[PDB]
Amino acid sequence: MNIFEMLRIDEGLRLKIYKDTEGYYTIGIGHLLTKSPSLNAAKSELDKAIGRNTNGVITKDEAEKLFNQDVDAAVRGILRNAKLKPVYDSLDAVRRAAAINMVFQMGETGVAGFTNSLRMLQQKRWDEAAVNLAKSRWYNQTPNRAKRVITTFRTGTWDAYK
């Protein structure tokens, strides 16, 4: 298991524009297109992202391409953030994958706000972090996904994904 397979499982793969759990237009492997309610705005952001007139549909390769870009951006966002990087560098490989998933999902600012959990993770207080991480809107809105990520930070193993 790795970050890619992990996110492919949590996000799924959809070749046509769809709405995510918050109702925003998305495509591929969780590639958010726009927060706007306008489908045309979404079609325009998609065409710009792909480089062609897609008419709201892309191929598997195009999806995987956007996915690679998005994972890369997520890692880079963590490294660039002064509140995230030190935590991230303190973690083992498995746990780092969990941090990437969260950022991919809610953004760097979003994760940078889990101050208290950040500190517990840095201190390697796994069970405590786990409990604090569940006290969030993220967990109440996508509890199955949040449980899998939480267990991963908790245990340092990929068990929740097997």
Known binding-site positions for substrate: 32, 104, 117, 132
Beta strands in 3-137 (DSSP E): 14-19, 25-28, 31-34
Query: Which of positions 17-76 make contact with ligand XE (CB under 6 A)?
Result: none
Nearest to 96 by CA among 85, 83, 81: 85
Shortest separation between residue 95's beta carbon and ligand XE, angstroms: 8
- Cα separation, 133 vs 136, in Å, equals 6
Tokens 């950040």, residue located:
118
Of the candidates 88, 101, 104, 146, which one interacts with ligand XE according to CB under 6 A? 88
Nearer to Cl ion, 44 or 142 (CB): 142
Q: Is 30 left (phi over 0), alpha (psi -120 to 50) or beta?
A: left
Which partner, Cl ion, ligand XE, none, binds residue 84 by CB below 5 to 8 Å per kind?
Answer: ligand XE
Restricting to residues 48-77, name those near Cl ion by CB under 5 A.
49
Site string for ligand XE, 95-114 (x = CB under 6 A): ----x--x--------x--x
Q: Are 70 and 104 in contact (CB under 8 A)?
A: yes
- Residue with Cβ nearer ligand XE (29 or 103): 103
Q: Are 27 and 14 in contact (CB under 8 A)?
A: yes
Residues that bind ligand XE (CB under 6 A): 78, 84, 87-88, 99, 102, 111, 114, 117-118
